[PDB]
Structure formats: structure tokens, C-alpha cells
Homo-oligomer: A and B are copies of this chain.
Amino acid sequence: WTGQESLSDSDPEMWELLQREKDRQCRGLELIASENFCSRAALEALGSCLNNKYSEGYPGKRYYGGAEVVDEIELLCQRRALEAFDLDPAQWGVNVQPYSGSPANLAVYTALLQPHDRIMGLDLPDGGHLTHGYMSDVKRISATSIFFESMPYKLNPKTGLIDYNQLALTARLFRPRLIIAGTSAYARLIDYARMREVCDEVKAHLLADMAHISGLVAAKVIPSPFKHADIVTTTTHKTLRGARSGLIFYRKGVKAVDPKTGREIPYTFEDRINFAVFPSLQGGPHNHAIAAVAVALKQACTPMFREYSLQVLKNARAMADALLERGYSLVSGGTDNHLVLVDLRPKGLDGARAERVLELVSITANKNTCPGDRSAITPGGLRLGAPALTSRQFREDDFRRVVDFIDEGVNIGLEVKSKTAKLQDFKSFLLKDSETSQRLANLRQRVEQFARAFPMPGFDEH
């Protein structure tokens, strides 16, 4: 046994599952706003020998030895991270060891906040993520609501935008020490200048969790949160189109000048955050992922990525306006980023029903709670994403054809809402009914034909 034999001969059970998943990505219309297709160059670094190195510590501050090469790799990733976002190295440092986006956000809270300290993020049904301190009316869901007392700020349901007025009002009463300026399901631009004004008043840090929009920020196609944020977290996949990991951008330099003393007061983020990632929360970093992050980061500084992110915005608004003409309403009217929020309620269907419909025809979308409905009620909306297909060289009229395939799916589900009463009656009827099964199969085959014709990043085989 040498360990150098291919997976096809070593584990045929898993190598088959690898090809079955690769076919699902090639034949399906991946419409989930958070999903992207990683390039082969990064995946070659993700599954490499760098797995075999315990580089506990930091470049130049390693607990072990033999970290000669991984130091150059970890340092290059930091330089490529700051270069991709046009950050000045004297004003910005970056940690590249967060295992994913969720451990990245908890690292920032652990670094700058005591247990039970207060944070404020957008509510989960309003568009914020779990890691922004989401808790329900019965249970503390995210561990961010357990180790820290979180109060969410909500949207204004009349406009679908963030209620920046109610945020400033409740921040004065709640007195949070950290406010999250980032979303998971939000089709509009976050007013980071308004977030900083609130944070400057209540003496709170401004964290920008740009996971969904990091690629657009790196391409400078949307306003960059670094102009106002103190700490900036992001996943390394999604719009960045890299391996699953996370980054933590922090301000280094001088915070401000002393008022009555006239003295430069420094920033104390680097050593607090770098200590929170290790040895507080994590252990040995995944140098294979760090390298893969660096490969995708190098791709972000290229005119290729500027054109790709630009096409994402064009595809998203092309998908938005196409949805509007067919009779669909959208949260906040349309989109200014990479995703659109469809409101299926004025069309007679809920997101939980339509997502199962689209899932059976290889169209992976996700239900979304629309502004107004009290969360627990079956979500009457969907969240659609552009970066996934755009990575496969999708065009505007290609996304317009995507909307056509959704219009057929919604109508198929609409005919089942009349033939059924409950959601599980809806789910089972889609599989057991004779006529409804073949029309789902016909739409699926027509979807898979159109989807397979486009390219696909990564390996041909897996």
C-alpha cells in the first residue's frame, strides 16, 4: 500500500458518488444565491499535500517547525487578499485561517466582546444570517445568541429596505458593542455610512459580513464596505468563487487622535482577532484551503473577474426584469447586487411549494420569508442567485430563459395547490400522480438539456 492510487480504483463507491454529484451540478440550474462553482486551479490546491502540515501559529510565530513553505503560502494569501480589495497594508491586516464564514464571525465576537456582550444584526427572516445573533421566540438558535446577547434589527416592510431609522433608535436603547452590517438574503446595497454613524454614536464596532457580495466588492462593481467598516468578514466562496473558507479583515493603524491630549490612539484589532482564531477557537489551519483561497484571490484581481462580477449584476437585473414582466413581484422592487427576492404570494403560491417544484426539475432555489409574514407561516417567497450560472458563462437572455423555466414550474405547482390542501399532500402528489409526474419529468429534461450545454469550472470528471 503506497497511498498513491487513484480514487476510481481505491473507492469505487465514493468515486461514483463524486460523478453523480458532478452530473447534478452540470445538469441543474443552480439558482441558490450563495452557491458558486469553484475553479479547477483552486480545487487542485484544496486537495493537495498541504493537508499534511500542522501550521499552528502564524507566519513567523509558529509553535512547530518546518513551516517554511506554508509561511510563504499564508503570507501570499494575505497579500492577495489585501490586493484584491484595494486595501492599504498599513491600514488593513487580514486573517486567512477561519475554517469557514461562521467560525470567522464568532472569531470577531470572541476577539472584541466578553461573554454575554451585546450585538445587533439583521434578523434572519429579514435577511441576516445566523451568525448575526439570530434567536427565536422559544430557543436561542445560533450560538451567537448564547455566548452573546443579540437583539435584531428588522426591515421596513413597506419598502423592503433596512429600517436604518429604527436601527438607530433601538441601538441607543439596546447599547450594543458591535453591529453587523451584512446580509444573506437582501437584494439592495447596505448604507455603510449610515451604519458607521450609528456605531460611532453608541460606541460600537462596525462589522461588515460581506460573504454574499465579496466578489462584487473585490471587482469594485459595488460600493466597498472597507470605507466605513472596522472589521470585515467574508466567506471565500460565493461571489469570490473559491474554496470553502473565511477571511477576517481588520483595521490596523491609528484609531483617532486624543481630544484633550493630542495623541495618536492606535487600533487594537490585530492581536485580539489573531488570538481569537488561534489558539482560542481553532487549531491547525487548513493550509490546503488557505492555498486554494489564495488561488481564487489572485483570480479576483484580474480583468476576468471584473468582467465576471459585472455580468453577475447584469444577469441578476435581467432575471429581475424578466420576472417582473411575467407578473411576479420582487422585494424592494428589484436588485442592485447578485440576487433577487421573489414574492410568490400575489401569484398564489408559497416558496416552500415552488422550491420543491423547482427542485424536481433540477432548479435549486430556496424559500425566503417575505417582509410582513410572521416567519413561521410557510414562506411565500424565493431567493434566486446569479453568480452560479454566470460562472458557467450565462448571458442575460440565458437568465431570461431561466425565468421561463421558473414560470412553467410555478404554474405546475399552482395546479397542484388546487388539487391538494396541505404541504405534504403537495409534496407527495408531485411524485405519485400520473399526469403531474410526466410534466415534471418533461420540464426537468428540458431544463437539463439547456443546462448541460454551458461550461462548468473544476474537473471534467469530478
Q: Which residues of A contact B (CB under 8 A)?
A: 1-7, 9-11, 13-15, 17-18, 20-22, 24-25, 28, 30, 32, 34-54, 63-66, 68-70, 72-73, 76, 99-103, 106, 110, 115-116, 118, 129-131, 135, 137, 141-143, 146-147, 149, 151-154, 170, 173-175, 202-203, 237, 241, 243-244, 276, 279-284, 286, 288, 291-292, 294-295, 298-299, 304, 308, 355-356, 358-359, 362, 364-367, 391, 393, 455-460, 462
With A102-B282, A455-B2 already in contact, the answer to whether A51 and B65 are too (CB < 8 A) is: no
Q: Is the CB of B47 within 8 A of A2?
A: no
For A366, the chain B residues whose CB sits under 8 A away are 63-65
Q: Is the CB of A130 within 8 A of B457?
A: no
**CA separation between A355 and B66, bound complex, in Å?**
10
**What are 21 A-to-B residue pairs whose CB atoms are below 8 Å?**
A3-B40, A3-B241, A4-B460, A7-B40, A7-B42, A10-B39, A10-B41, A10-B295, A11-B298, A13-B298, A18-B44, A25-B53, A30-B52, A45-B47, A51-B237, A100-B283, A103-B282, A106-B281, A129-B283, A137-B175, A244-B284
Write the nearest CB–CB distance from A204 to chain B, whole angstroms. 11
**CA separation between A35 and B47, bound complex, in Å?**
16
Selected from B41, B135, B173, B457, the residue in CB contact (under 8 A) with A170 is B173
**CA separation between A205 and B365, bound complex, in Å?**
41
Q: Is the CB of A45 within 8 A of B364?
A: no
Write the nearest CB–CB distance from A297 to chain B, whole angstroms. 10
With A47-B292, A142-B280 already in contact, the answer to whether A20 and B460 are too (CB < 8 A) is: no
For A391, the chain B residues whose CB sits under 8 A away are 3
> Which 10 pairs of residues, A with B, have the shortest CB-CB distance?
A47-B47, A3-B457, A65-B359, A66-B364, A46-B47, A10-B41, A3-B39, A7-B44, A102-B283, A21-B69
With A73-B21, A137-B203 already in contact, the answer to whether A462 and B49 are too (CB < 8 A) is: yes
Identify the closest chain B residue to A150 (Cβ): B175
Selected from B49, B72, B146, the residue in CB contact (under 8 A) with A280 is B146
Q: Is the CB of A141 within 8 A of B280?
A: yes
Q: Is the CB of A64 within 8 A of B364?
A: yes
Identify the closest chain B residue to A137 (Cβ): B175
Q: Is the CB of B48 within 8 A of A18?
A: yes
Write the nearest CB–CB distance from A458 to chain B, whole angstroms. 5
Q: Is the CB of B460 within 8 A of A14?
A: no
Q: Is the CB of A130 within 8 A of B308?
A: no
**CA separation between A236 and B455, bound complex, in Å?**
34
Q: Is the CB of B14 within 8 A of A294?
A: yes
**CA separation between A137 and B45, bound complex, in Å?**
41
Q: Is the CB of B146 within 8 A of A110?
A: yes
Q: Is the CB of B18 within 8 A of A37?
A: no
Q: Is the CB of A52 within 8 A of B66?
A: no
For A15, the chain B residues whose CB sits under 8 A away are 44
Identify the closest chain B residue to A123 (Cβ): B173
**CA separation between A118 and B174, bound complex, in Å?**
11
Write the nearest CB–CB distance from A418 to chain B, whole angstroms. 23
**CA separation between A45 and B73, bound complex, in Å?**
22
Selected from B42, B73, B292, the residue in CB contact (under 8 A) with A17 is B73
Q: Is the CB of A6 within 8 A of B298?
A: no
With A3-B37, A7-B41, A103-B103 already in contact, the answer to whether A279 and B130 are too (CB < 8 A) is: yes
Selected from B5, B283, B294, B304, the residue in CB contact (under 8 A) with A41 is B5
Write the nearest CB–CB distance from A67 to chain B, whole angstroms. 9
Q: Is the CB of B455 within 8 A of A102?
A: no
For A130, the chain B residues whose CB sits under 8 A away are 279-280, 283
Q: Is the CB of A52 within 8 A of B64?
A: no
**CA separation between A118 and B292, bound complex, in Å?**
39
For A364, the chain B residues whose CB sits under 8 A away are 64-66
**CA separation between A52 and B392, bound complex, in Å?**
13
Write the nearest CB–CB distance from A9 to chain B, whole angstroms. 8
